[PDB]
Design a protein around this ligand. Structure first.
Ligand SMILES: N#Cc1ccc2c(-c3ccncc3)c(-c3ccc(F)cc3)nn2c1
Ligand SMILES: [Cl-]
Ligand SMILES: [Cl-]
Length: 306
């Protein structure tokens, strides 16, 4: 049958990899598009049912897509949420693998707000990457606003009732993307709120510079590759990363790297630190992004960009 979850008709496939078979969809009652995720029934790693619950907990938060359905049709588990636009990594490639300082600042304060709101709901993301931050669709009120998806790596870091932080431990497995993960993650330490923000700091320099100095490293295995990357992170000062860039980005990374394990980060202070960049450069925070000027002003399109 073409309809899953009673009200959602399948459509074009937009993915089939690290997170299952993903399709485009359309709500058959109102026509609103949706994203349909397919995951097999008996799998080695069941991560969908907990993701549906994560969207339900974060329901109503701006930037988090609404969860509409979770089902068991056939040998597949199905999740239906809002259909969003391209990822920040997608817009990054289309803009020449470099974002302007103004775009990075405005995107950074939305990413900090998203991650904060996740932390308010007693969760840490632990998978910070530009590929998981998506903009909206065209004509929508949140077309160029940043969103956050994919919560399969999220974990509760404090009791939802007593607000007691999880204990600190080590000797944990290195899981995530080595290009952005915190230094503490490279060392197998337990992740907390500080590690989501440090990873953001890596992405900010990634957007600004077009690359990170620990990209393209070689090693016989993947374990030694993750170690060489982590070694370069502890070898490269933040001011070295911030060469020719507003030093508030290095000041941000050094601050989040110095946070204690159970400390609540000063989110609004970090947003005010990055906003001061626009004051030093005489720029306004009006919401104008680099990808909005793509294709003579049309923006991103399907045939040319991807
Ligand atoms: N790299 C990468 C990458 C890009 C985009 C993307 C999406 C997505 C979200 C909204 N609209 C369209 C695509 C999802 C996803 C997450 C949960 C869900 F229930 C359905 C889909 N994962 N994901 C991964
Ligand atoms: Cl885990
Ligand atoms: Cl790499």
């Amino acid at each position: 049958s073409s309809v899953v979850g009673l009200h959602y008709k399948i459509g074009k496939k937009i993915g089939e990899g690290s997170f299952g078979v993903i399709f485009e969809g359309t709500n058959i009652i109102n026509g609103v598009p949706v994203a349909i995720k397919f995951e097999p029934r008996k799998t080695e790693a069941p991560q969908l049912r907990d993701e549906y619950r994560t969207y339900k907990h974060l329901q109503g938060c701006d930037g988090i897509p609404n969860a509409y359905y979770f089902g068991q049709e056939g040998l597949h588990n199905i999740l239906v949420i809002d259909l969003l636009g391209p990822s920040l990594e997608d817009l990054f490639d289309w803009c020449g693998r470099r974002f302007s300082v103004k775009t990075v600042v405005q995107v950074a304060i939305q990413m900090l707000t998203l991650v904060e709101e996740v932390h308010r709901h007693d969760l840490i993301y632990r998978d910070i990457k530009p590929d998981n931050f998506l903009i909206g669709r065209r004509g929508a009120t949140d077309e160029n606003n940043v969103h956050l998806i994919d919560f399969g790596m999220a974990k509760q870091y404090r009791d939802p009732r007593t607000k007691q932080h999880i204990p600190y431990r080590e000797k944990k497995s290195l899981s995530g993307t080595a290009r952005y993960m915190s230094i503490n993650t490279h060392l197998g330490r337990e992740q907390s709120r500080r590690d989501d923000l440090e990873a953001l700091g890596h992405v900010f320099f990634y957007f600004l510079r077009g690359q990170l100095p620990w990209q393209g490293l070689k090693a016989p295995t993947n374990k030694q590759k993750y170690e060489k990357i982590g070694d370069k992170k502890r070898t490269t000062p933040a001011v070295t990363l911030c060469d020719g860039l507003p030093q508030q980005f290095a000041e941000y990374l050094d601050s989040v790297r110095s946070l204690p394990f159970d400390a609540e980060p000063p989110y609004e202070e970090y947003r005010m630190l990055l906003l001061s960049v626009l004051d030093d450069l005489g720029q306004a925070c009006d919401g104008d992004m680099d990808w909005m000027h793509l294709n003579g002003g049309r923006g991103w399109d399907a045939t040319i960009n991807k």
